């Protein structure tokens, strides 16, 4: 599924991401956007092998199994094609494990390199929430 930006973010705030560890919504819908062009089904390989999953490409080097990236956690208790559900509540959960895992968003590459220090309220005006 392919989100619309409103929508992302009405379903992000449903889930309990607004103002989860201090990210205002904003900055989950940038994130998502950057990431993934807010599709669930988004897939992209990494050089060590692993895989980074669904709307927020969460990684299976550590987050989720995908059964080919040996030598890997599986933190967030889900087999990875979970992540890439019409139903973003797999992906939110997990992502709530790793917000809070010290490095808040920082572990998101293109929250870190296109939406941190930038004016994310933009990605949600207009929107009914
Ligand atoms: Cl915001
Ligand atoms: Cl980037
Ligand atoms: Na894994």
């Not at 897939?43 to 040996?70: A, E, K, V």
Request: hydrophobic share 35%.
């Amino acid at each position: 599924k392919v989100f619309g930006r409103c929508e992302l973010a009405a379903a992000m705030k449903r889930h309990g991401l607004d103002n989860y560890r201090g990210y205002s919504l904003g900055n989950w819908v940038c994130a998502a956007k950057f990431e993934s062009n807010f599709n669930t089904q988004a897939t992209n390989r990494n050089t060590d092998g692993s895989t980074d999953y669904g709307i927020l490409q969460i990684n299976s080097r550590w987050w989720c199994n995908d059964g080919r990236t040996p030598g890997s956690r599986n933190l967030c208790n889900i087999p990875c094609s979970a992540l890439l559900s019409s139903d973003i509540t797999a992906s939110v959960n997990c992502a709530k494990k790793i917000v809070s895992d010290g490095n808040g968003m920082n572990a998101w590459v293109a929250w870190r390199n296109r939406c941190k220090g930038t004016d994310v309220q933009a990605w949600i005006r207009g929107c009914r929430l």
